């Protein structure tokens, strides 16, 4: 044949892959965690969005920390040979490095380790995307007026917010991040590379959103998401 390049992930396997959405809305009383109003808007948006990208979407609601770990374990032990990629979406309370089951926390590193290059072989070399709508701390942004491959390779963490910061969720419209994510995937998934889509998501969140609160502490605050990429190639959701 003629000259061949290689800087984009192969996305023309028979299946695009799984999209696991963990939607945690109601939390055991003993945890002391509030209900996450509007998260169902988010779960439903994501479901539709990723359906249109031809992912096999599985929605899960209100999982204990035990259920989260066993679900991720089981999904990682499936044969993904015919799938191009893996996507997992976490919607819950959180803190830096941490996501909450309905009855207590889960180390994010525990969840993602299941999918390490050496531990999930049918996903080695393929993009593993973790999209996390959850707090990474309690800081507020007050804004300003304007072997042979690493086992950690081929991961992408699309964080809703900067390290150390709260993440904002609107109980009517859904979270700022997920709203913006789905809109940008809708409009640009058939033409832009994923990092450039996520960059549009950064700008949308940074520019179009600002908290309104009766509490001065939480009023007029801003948010910037955080793209953490360990990808080794460009990711286009379409192929030719």
């Amino acid at each position: 044949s003629g000259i061949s390049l290689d800087n984009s992930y192969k996305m023309d396997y028979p299946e695009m892959g799984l999209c696991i959405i963990i939607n945690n809305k109601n939390f055991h009383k003993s945890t002391g965690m509030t209900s996450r109003s509007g998260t169902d808007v988010d779960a439903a948006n994501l479901r539709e969005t990723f359906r249109n990208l031809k992912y096999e979407v599985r929605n899960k609601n209100d999982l204990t920390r035990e259920e989260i770990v066993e679900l991720m374990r089981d999904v990682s032990k499936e044969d993904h040979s015919k799938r191009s990629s893996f996507v997992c979406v976490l919607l819950s309370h959180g803190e830096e490095g941490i996501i909450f089951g309905t009855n207590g926390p889960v180390d994010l590193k525990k969840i993602v380790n299941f999918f390490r290059g050496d531990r999930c072989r049918s996903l080695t070399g393929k993009p593993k995307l973790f999209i996390i709508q959850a707090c990474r701390g309690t800081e507020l942004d007050c804004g300003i007026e304007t072997h042979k491959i690493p086992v950690e390779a081929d991961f992408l963490y699309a964080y809703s917010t900067a390290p150390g910061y709260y993440s904002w969720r609107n109980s009517k419209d859904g979270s700022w991040f997920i709203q913006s994510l789905c809109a940008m995937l809708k409009q640009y998934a058939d033409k832009l590379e994923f990092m450039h889509i996520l960059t549009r998501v950064n700008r949308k969140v940074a520019t179009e959103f600002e908290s309104f609160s009766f509490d001065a502490t939480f009023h007029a605050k801003k948010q910037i998401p955080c793209i953490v990429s360990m990808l080794t190639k460009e990711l286009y959701f379409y192929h030719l």
Binding site: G94, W168, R169, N170, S171, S175, F212, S213, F218
Partner: peptide, 4 residues
């Protein structure tokens, strides 16, 4: 608006 609420925080997660």
């Amino acid at each position: 608006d609420e925080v997660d």
